[PDB]
Every structure is written in structure tokens, then in C-alpha cells.
Amino acid sequence: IAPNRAENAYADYVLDIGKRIPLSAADLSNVYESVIRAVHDSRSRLIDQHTVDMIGNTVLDALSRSQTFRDAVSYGIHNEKVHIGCIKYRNEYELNEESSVKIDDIQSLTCNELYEYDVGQEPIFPICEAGENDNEEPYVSFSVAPDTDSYEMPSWQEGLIHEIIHHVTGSSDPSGDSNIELGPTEILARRVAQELGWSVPDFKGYAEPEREAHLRLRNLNALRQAAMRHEENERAFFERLGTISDRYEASPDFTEYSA
């Protein structure tokens, strides 16, 4: 009898069961290829090439260097969860209701209104979730990627791994809001981060105020950085973010930014 998917015990269950049938080198090779394909096919729903690359780098690095991630992934493949190669990626955002910002839509946002608000009143929020589309195909929506070498990068990577773990292990977050338990999804993601040398803050609970503040500020900064990357194409940037947030396809070739 397995632990419930929302209890901390579920994390160790997943790893124990996952280690029983390890990915062969050929198995891993094929998973590696499926992820590359999946991420490449995610372009039409990601904000920019940088984010495409970073998602790819992050998942592939985790597969290459983290036994925990490989165990979680193998668990999913052999125990009727999501095969990681089936997962596509998106950068869906949502207007913040409390914001004083006066805009009808994400498309209308400007770099300015993004920088004229600190955490608490920021104009938009990323949607970070493991969901499924109409055809029941799994996707992960997550923050745009922060700049290479940014403070935000390891936390962003750990958070991305977190969402994938939902899919590939079927793990949940804690049922109630807690300051002392992380839940099995976050537990696993933290182990992966530790194995890969991603420096993330040592939080105790999934809903700890410091954790909530950290995430919000990471997201705001990742978004500011992403916008600044496309400073010359400001309208194109927010229009694409809106297109994706409305659940439409944008150019898989990012022609909106083209020289």
C-alpha cells in the first residue's frame, strides 16, 4: 500500500519503487531525445528562445546528473504516471486583481508598469502548474526564464523540476497550507536541486511566508529580466505573453522579435 500522494512519505515511496527498474543507458538515451523534441515543440507556447533553451538545459541536466530525478522519471514510466517526454511547456500569465495598474489585458502591458511596482502590487503573475489540455496531454506552465547567471536561475530551475515531478510521479503539494511541511513534490524537487548544485533557500514549509515572498519576487524579477531582453521589441514581448496566456499559439520561430 502506497502513501497518499499528498503526504511526505510519498516522496520516498516514489524513489524506492523507482529504483526497482532503473533506466538503461539506451532507455535514458531515448528519454533524453523525447525531452529535446518535447521542448522544441513547446516553442509556440514559450515567450522566447532563451526560455526554450533553459527549460531544455534544466530538464536534461536533471536527467543526466540527478539520480533522484532519474528515479522519479523511471517511476512514472513504469508505474502508470506521465512519461516525461510527453510533457510540453508554456509561459501562461494572469492579471493580478489587486493591482492598481490600469490595463485591460497583458497585451497592453509596458516595461514601465512592470518596474513601477514591487511584490504585492505587481501587474501580472505567472501560472505555475502541472495541467492537462483538452486532449488530456500533460503540460507545465511556469515563469518565463530569468537571465543566464541571474540570482533567480537556480530557484527557477528547482521550481520547474517541481512542476514536472507532479506529472511524472503523480505527487501533490500539502493539502493544507503549512509552514513546517514541504509536501512530497517539493521534497523531491529539493533533493534534485541538491544533487545538481542549484542553490535554493532552505525553506521548511510549502506555504511559509518567506517562501511565498521569495517565489513572488523571483517571478517578478524573471519577468523584468525577460522583458529587458526584448527591450527593443516591447510591444511584441507583451503581445506574445498575452497570446500564450490566452492559450493560443505564437510563432514557433519567434518571428515577432525578428531583426
158 binds Zn ion (CB under 5 A): no
Q: Which residue is nearest to Mg ion (CB)?
A: 105
Cβ nearer to Zn ion, comparing 141 with 185? 185
92 binds Zn ion (CB under 5 A): no
* Binding at 105: pick from Zn ion, Mg ion, none (beta carbon under 5-8 Å per type): Mg ion
Cβ atoms 188, 72 nearer than 8 A: yes
Helices (H) and strands (E) in the chain, counts: 9, 5
Q: Residues 65-104: x/- map of binding to Mg ion (CB under 5 A)? A: ----------------------------------------
Instruction: Tell the smallest beta-carbon distance from residue 98 to Zn ion (Å).
Output: 23
Q: Which residue is nearest to Zn ion (CB)?
A: 173
Cβ atoms 205, 226 nearer than 8 A: no
How is residue 1 written as a grid cell?
Answer: 500500500
118 binds Mg ion (CB under 5 A): no
- Report the distance separating Cα 155 and Cα 149, nearest Å: 12
Binding part of the chain for Zn ion, among 39-47, 88-96, 179-187, 249-257 by CB under 5 A, reads: 179-187
- Report the distance separating Cα 80 and Cα 96, nearest Å: 36
105 binds Mg ion (CB under 5 A): yes
Cβ atoms 189, 165 nearer than 8 A: yes
